[PDB]
Design a protein around this ligand. Structure first.
Ligand SMILES: Nc1ncnc2c1ncn2[C@@H]1O[C@H](COP(=O)(O)OP(=O)(O)OP(=O)(O)O)[C@@H](O)[C@H]1O
Ligand SMILES: Nc1ncnc2c1ncn2[C@@H]1O[C@H](COP(=O)(O)OP(=O)(O)OP(=O)(O)O)[C@@H](O)[C@H]1O
Ligand SMILES: [Mg+2]
Ligand SMILES: [Mg+2]
Lengths: 57, 52, 355, 355
């Protein structure tokens, strides 16, 4: 008797794979944009400290 | 080229993940705008304080 | 991970059927036993050319199947469309499993009129456990264009089901008779599954498949000829086929109908003689033995006697459900027998699922 | 992306025809069914030498087709002109799909009297699923000079349509009979489509095309001879052909007309005997079987009996629309039958579109 299993080939395979890659790209872009939002936050806190020094002046 | 509006009308993991991704992209746009605005406000308070 | 999964008849085209066998306990003993079975006429636009092409509607239909079943299981084996799968034999040299899989894909590359972009799965027609390195390889390749499989996996995914085996119908239909075949083991048996989209022939020595061949002709042809000759819709032509051809009061309608279906009868017989002659390669001086029928297109009244006299082989209906325990308090053996041919595969990959 | 597209007869030359079949529901059952059909005489200057050469006017005509149809669908399959496509067989070695496509383009490079600058699409006359690596390749190449395809895509683009398949007429005309052919599967059948610009012959074993051949002669020739012999315009000569040759009161006009068209009749018969003899390559001791006709040029009165007695084959008209469900409350079966030969392709690539 022949026991066959067409489970995980291929438009299922490569569409789960494309599904993975698109999400990895999403993650990378969002991590980069995150880092940007950060570095911005730091320059802003520095500016705030300079300005509070001025207000003390 | 048909099976693709069938897939585009359907979804499960690929599109649940996709929707999560568009949502987190929107939220990051929102928080980046919400860190750009305190910049402008902050430069404003600078211009006021110096004028004092 | 071990559950006893489930089984739908996903490529029924005429009908989506589903079966739950598990191990039923009685008196401290247990065994494979029918637990539920459900059937719904397939709403068309779901399937076209063997691809699932309204994954949403098919999803909702499968959900109706699970509800009618009253089953809590959410794992499933299913099957691809015979129009969606290329099945053929292939000769190689056996070796390492990787070298076989690659070499298999390399030879079937020639065999596939699509990019790969294509599903490849083989099994060996003879036990590998019988031959030495570099010698006597035979695998049969099941190849499927990619998103027939996708479409089916989407359907399964939104029905809440999890697939574990995507099998093929010409061999899944055999698991019910695989025992009764395994008892006569030099006997050559034919198995015809006359469905609505395709008619499969698989011919065996024992429960060892020797070959398979798929014919485009099916019951949709008889229905379509009735519809042509009486400008009827497909449904009323289908009922005129069913009840029209088999009632005790049908004495006036086998001229009107039989004259309509006579071309299909002749030409089906021509296709079956065709395939049978195309097999008889090695025994130029022998004859046939015995054969069985499955699928609802078989249930055409008197079609079994016609195929029997026309092909020179005894063609008999068979009850699959004999392979499984059936509680008489939950199921009528008579009705079970009546819907047996349609359900053969529907319990087929279903013994594949607690396997 | 899945819609049920549409189908025009874009290379009708005499007529632009369009058909909408989709799946029509009745009593909870559905099936492919005629939804609409429209026909408009092609305004000339649209097509010359098989190229669309007034993409604007053709656009507006196709828009009129969509409006007369009352169809909301905006996707379409269509066909190229038989004068615009080179179809021929080609022998190769099968292998990887890329290596086949390249090798195919390499061999047909020899076959194309234009730069490439040329459309190449093949299909295998036998299932690839039947032969081993490096062996037994047969593809048939459809090759088309580039902007026949462009011109048609411009026409489709400004009509608001989106093309998904650009098929060929000699095989698209067959999809309606592909079932009825698939039931006799060692029978050699001829299919003639006598159009206005070209007459195609395709000859098959089953619905498996064995070959095709395109003849410049067509109905435009009969009309043009009538016009020559009675210094008439093309339109009144065309009507004199149609109604003149077939009326019950036409007893005085088959001498005046038949003497005009007799050269064309002889010489068409000569071309068809020509092609048939050029096929009979392998069976030097056999005869023909049965054949069908399509296209309006076929509907010349008595032409079927003439081709039948002259070619030594039974040549019969056939009703395509038998492949599709037809609601009798929306369509008269008689008229449908009357316009069937013209519409054969017009429903052809139309079963290609919900496929
Ligand atoms: N009593 C009967 N007489 C004649 N034909 C019948 C009868 N019962 C069912 N059929 C036909 O059998 C077909 C359905 O049988 P079945 O469900 O076994 O096929 P299927 O497995 O759904 O089709 P496929 O697997 O080929 O897609 C229908 O076409 C129906 O017209
Ligand atoms: N009753 C008839 N008798 C004779 N000729 C006819 C009749 N009806 C139509 N024709 C001819 O058939 C031709 C149109 O048929 P049809 O529309 O099937 O061809 P077509 O598909 O438009 O042409 P092509 O595809 O070759 O460009 C016209 O040349 C017309 O003169
Ligand atoms: Mg079946
Ligand atoms: Mg035409």
């Amino acid at each position: 008797m022949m026991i066959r299993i067409n489970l995980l080939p291929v438009r299922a395979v490569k569409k789960r794979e494309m599904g993975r890659q698109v999400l990895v790209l999403f993650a990378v872009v969002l991590i980069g944009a995150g880092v940007a939002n950060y570095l911005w936050y730091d320059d802003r806190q520095s500016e705030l400290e300079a300005h509070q020094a001025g207000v003390a002046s | 080229m048909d099976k693709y509006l069938d897939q585009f009308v359907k979804a499960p993991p690929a599109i649940k993940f996709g929707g999560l991704a568009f949502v987190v992209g929107a939220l990051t746009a929102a928080n980046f705008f919400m860190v750009i605005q305190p910049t402008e406000e902050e430069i404003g308070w600078a211009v006021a304080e110096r004028r004092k | 991970a071990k559950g006893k999964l489930v089984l739908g008849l996903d490529i029924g085209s005429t009908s989506i059927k589903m079966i739950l066998l598990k191990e039923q306990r009685k008196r401290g003993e247990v065994i494979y036993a029918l637990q539920s079975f459900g059937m719904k006429p397939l709403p068309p636009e779901a399937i076209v050319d063997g691809a699932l092409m309204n994954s949403t509607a098919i999803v909702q239909a499968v959900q109706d199947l699970m509800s009618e079943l009253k089953v809590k299981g959410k794992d499933v084996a299913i099957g691809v469309s015979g129009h969606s799968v290329i099945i053929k034999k292939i000769q190689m040299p056996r070796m390492s499993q990787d070298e076989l899989e690659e070499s298999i894909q390399w030879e079937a590359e020639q065999y596939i009129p699509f990019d790969v972009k294509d599903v490849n799965i083989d099994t060996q027609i003879l036990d590998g456990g019988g031959n030495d390195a570099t010698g006597q390889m035979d695998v049969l390749l099941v190849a499927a264009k990619k998103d027939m499989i996708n479409d089916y996996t989407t359907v399964v995914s939104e029905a809440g089901l999890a697939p574990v085996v995507v099998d093929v119908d010409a061999f899944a239909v055999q698991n019910m008779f695989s025992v009764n075949y395994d008892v006569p083991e030099r006997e050559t048996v034919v198995l015809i599954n006359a469905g609505a989209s395709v008619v499969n022939i698989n011919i065996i020595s024992n429960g060892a498949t020797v070959f398979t061949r798929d014919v485009t002709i099916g019951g949709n042809q008889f229905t379509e000829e009735i519809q042509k000759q009486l400008n009827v819709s497909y449904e009323e032509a289908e009922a005129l086929k069913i009840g029209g051809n088999g009632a005790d009061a049908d004495a006036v309608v086998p001229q009107d109908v039989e004259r309509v279906l006579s071309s299909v009868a002749e030409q089906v017989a021509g296709e079956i003689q065709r395939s049978l002659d195309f097999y008889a390669g090695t025994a130029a001086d022998s004859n046939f033995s015995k054969v069985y029928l499955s699928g609802g297109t078989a249930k055409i009244p008197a079609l079994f006697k016609t195929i029997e006299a026309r092909t020179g082989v005894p063609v008999e209906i068979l009850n699959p459900f004999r392979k499984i325990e059936v509680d008489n308090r939950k199921f009528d053996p008579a009705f079970v027998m009546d819907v047996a041919p349609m359900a053969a595969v529907a319990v087929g990959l279903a013994l594949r699922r607690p396997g």
